[PDB]
Design a protein around this ligand. Structure first.
Ligand SMILES: [Cl-]
Ligand SMILES: [Cl-]
Lengths: 281, 282
């Protein structure tokens, strides 16, 4: 009766502080073993792993039938031990937000998390595929994950080849990420950045027989988050940056905070696997 | 290092009257303690080419739990085949997803057999796994040939499902034979709803890097022949203002190809059916 997931495995890693992480890995479906994979392969790391692993895995498998298929790559979902939910609110609050002075308690642990990914997760995944070598590495994240991806690019650009910021929470802590962006731009193989967002995030339409008070509240919230304009402001700031090879920005029409995750992660891994290297910006 | 478990889900094997096997994969909201947690009316979506879309549909449904317009979700049913190392059964689906015609080659035209199997075998089997649950409404999703099946289902047996979701329907198949059924559907006589979608890169594909011009012109020629977008628009215009159709929703996904659009269409498909029902009149 139970659904067994093929060509995939999961294991638990602990960070320096002893906090546990669920590492889920998948590889091309046509593979008989892990060992069958040989030579250079791309790899993508997905934060909030529990929420995205299956979609990223299956989307990657679907590419096998596509004409522009190059051989695929390895999916790595970095998540938490959970039951009956996709997110660890407390853990991700620390792991995904950059350090600031006025940040409340339980925030500003992004550098701890990034160090963990580079020093613990990456080597552990590399060990699972001895015959495989990493052609290139991508970091994907959504919302707070998007903020982490941007933070990673601006403070440690050599860490990953491609950064995929899905609907990044630029709003967080009075637009503190824009300070790092300016410093990154003003400083003298450059990585690539993929920024995306849904059109319904900042400009949500009213539902069927939705009461006005409920709608204006969603409108107010949307206006404050300022998902589209903050993203457009960032991209305009990064425009003509020498430290960035390519900047791809996409507004997914008719997608909201939640629904866009399907789109962004699917295109993210597809372009990284099949369209590398991207054209200069 | 252990295998990856899929929680709040199960699979079982059914066989049609011809003795041909099927893998039925089912999932339900993640917050549920088990199957029996579910009570009262719930929506249910049936996805053909189940092996290719079950995990995306499942996880996309779970992701909606955090969304504002969440209303308890629904049940995902992926109707697939016993496969190992691939997502599609080319031979089986060729029969199951295409409607009967006099000119169709051998191995095609088994859509009615498949739709009977879904209604007579799959639906009751799933209902039996959730006795306390009532089926508020039913949706039939399919992609490519699956989209052709969804349209075929609507035109020949519109009462079978409440919603039909045709993702990039292969209207081109067999000299546009489906337009006969659509023509008869509109020119005769609670009305169901139809969701049609396609990728913008299907009919107008962009050139790849390091792609020879000769190779690119071959892809464009193929794309022009299949005529994904224009055939869909021609069909939607033909169905517009029809009495037997409650709502028609068409979408062109910008920058999506044949394969990539599947992620978008199935995700929005189940979301709209679960959260935005009933659709506004069209
Ligand atoms: Cl601060
Ligand atoms: Cl014919």
């Amino acid at each position: 009766t139970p659904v067994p997931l093929p060509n995939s495995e999961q294991f638990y890693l602990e960070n320096d502080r002893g906090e546990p992480y669920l590492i889920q890995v998948s590889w091309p479906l046509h593979w008989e073993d892990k060992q069958t994979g040989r030579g250079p392969l791309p790899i993508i790391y997905i934060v909030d792993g529990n929420a995205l692993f299956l979609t990223a895995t299956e989307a990657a498998w679907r590419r096998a039938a596509a004409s522009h298929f190059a051989g695929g790559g390895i999916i790595v979902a970095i998540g938490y031990p959970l039951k009956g939910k996709l997110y660890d609110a407390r853990r991700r609050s620390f792991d995904l937000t950059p350090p600031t002075a006025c940040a409340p308690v339980g925030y500003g642990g992004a550098d701890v998390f990034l160090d963990f990914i580079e020093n613990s997760v990456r080597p552990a995944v590399q060990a699972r595929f001895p015959q495989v070598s990493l052609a290139r590495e991508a970091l994907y994240g959504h919302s707070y994950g998007g903020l982490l991806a941007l933070h990673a690019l601006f403070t440690r650009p050599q860490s990953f080849d491609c950064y995929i910021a899905s609907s990044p929470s630029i709003w967080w802590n009075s637009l503190c990420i824009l300070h790092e962006a300016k410093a990154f731009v003003e400083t003298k193989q450059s990585p690539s950045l993929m920024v995306s967002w849904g059109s319904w995030q900042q400009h949500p339409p009213r539902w069927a027989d939705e009461l006005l008070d409920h709608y204006e509240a969603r409108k107010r919230t949307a206006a404050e988050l300022r998902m589209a304009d903050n993203a457009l402001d960032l991209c305009a700031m990064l425009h003509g940056c020498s430290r960035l090879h390519a900047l791809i920005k996409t507004e997914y029409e008719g997608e909201d905070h939640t629904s866009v995750m399907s789109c962004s992660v699917s295109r993210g891994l597809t372009m990284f696997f099949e369209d590398w290297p991207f054209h200069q910006s």
